[PDB]
């Protein structure tokens, strides 16, 4: 079984964060590969939140990235860490 | 399951690992075992081999040889080497 994620660092609207964890559970079951997961997230988020978008899916990594305000969200599912942002 | 004899060693014939990494690997164990014996000081020769793999090939090799054991492990594409020599069976896989 796969329980719902937990948002560590986040800047999303009460409506949006639901749509992100939504797309997150759909993506993880559909695609096995770590790059294929990311590839789905972005292309779905290109329909809802305009052309420009980016997504990473790392078991162990770190960064600082420049993101549009209210268009950043980092959620860690059980032993996997997904970082997505805008522009 | 079908084994085969190449470079004086009894390996699983469908060579999971690439045939260069396998040849250099078996040859180093045979040249390690010509020095240190498995019966006496058997921990040392594993640690010698483990470090050798990290030098010449990609890092984080796991090394497992015994007269009797049974393992199911996840490894990278073409990074799994399992060969018998006399009676002792040598397993190792890159991560």
């Amino acid at each position: 079984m796969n329980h719902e994620p937990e948002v560590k660092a986040t800047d999303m609207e009460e409506d949006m964060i639901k749509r992100v964890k939504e797309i997150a559970i759909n993506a993880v079951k559909e695609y096995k590969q770590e790059k294929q997961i990311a590839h789905y997230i972005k292309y779905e988020f290109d329909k809802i939140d305009g052309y420009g978008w980016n997504c990473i899916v790392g078991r162990n990594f770190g960064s600082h990235i420049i993101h549009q305000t209210k268009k950043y969200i980092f959620f860690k599912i059980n032993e996997l860490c997904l970082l997505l942002w805008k522009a | 399951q079908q084994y085969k004899t190449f470079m004086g060693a009894r390996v699983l014939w469908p060579p999971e690992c690439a045939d260069d990494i396998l040849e250099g690997a078996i040859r180093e164990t045979q040249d390690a075992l010509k020095k240190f014996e498995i019966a006496r000081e058997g921990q040392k020769i594993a640690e010698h081999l483990k470090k050798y793999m990290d030098d010449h090939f990609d890092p984080y090799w796991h090394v497992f040889f015994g007269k009797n054991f049974g393992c199911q492990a996840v490894h990278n594409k073409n990074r799994f080497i399992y060969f018998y020599i006399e009676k002792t069976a040598f397993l190792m896989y890159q991560t």
Partner: protein, 145 residues
């Protein structure tokens, strides 16, 4: 475990020795030792929480300020950026403190500052979660400001 397993009496050809008599004394003295190392830790562990209770307080004060004046915004703007950096670094810095205070509990027959500190540790983690929520609300208030 050496004082656990220590033999209570050994013997030779024509003599018995009673070890318990000595052995019993060594338990209460090598305990005093671990009690010391646990009270070299206890003071270390408590100085981190204090640093982590303040740091979280120090950031909450900048939010508590009205910040009506121009020059005031420029001060507490750098602190929201500080909050973020903390948010990244702190989730790393936290993991040691959570285990440090645990490990202690198992090794100290003391019940750490009654319940006053247990409450202060649970309040800290709540105060951090409130701060993140407050920083999101402040971010919106900031855009209108």
């Amino acid at each position: 475990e050496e004082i656990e397993k220590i033999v209570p009496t050994y013997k030779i050809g024509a003599m018995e020795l009673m070890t318990h008599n000595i052995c019993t004394s060594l338990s209460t003295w090598a305990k005093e030792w671990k009690l010391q190392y646990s009270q070299d830790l206890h003071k270390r562990a408590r100085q981190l929480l204090d640093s982590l209770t303040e740091q979280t307080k120090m950031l909450s004060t900048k939010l508590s300020k009205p910040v009506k004046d121009i020059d005031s915004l420029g001060y507490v703007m750098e602190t929201l950026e500080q909050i973020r950096k903390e948010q990244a670094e702190i989730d790393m810095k936290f993991n040691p403190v959570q285990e440090m205070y645990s490990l202690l509990d198992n090794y100290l027959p003391g019940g750490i500052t009654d319940k006053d500190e247990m409450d202060a540790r649970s309040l800290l983690r709540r105060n951090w979660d409130i701060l993140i929520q407050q920083a999101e609300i402040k971010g919106k208030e900031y855009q209108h400001k």
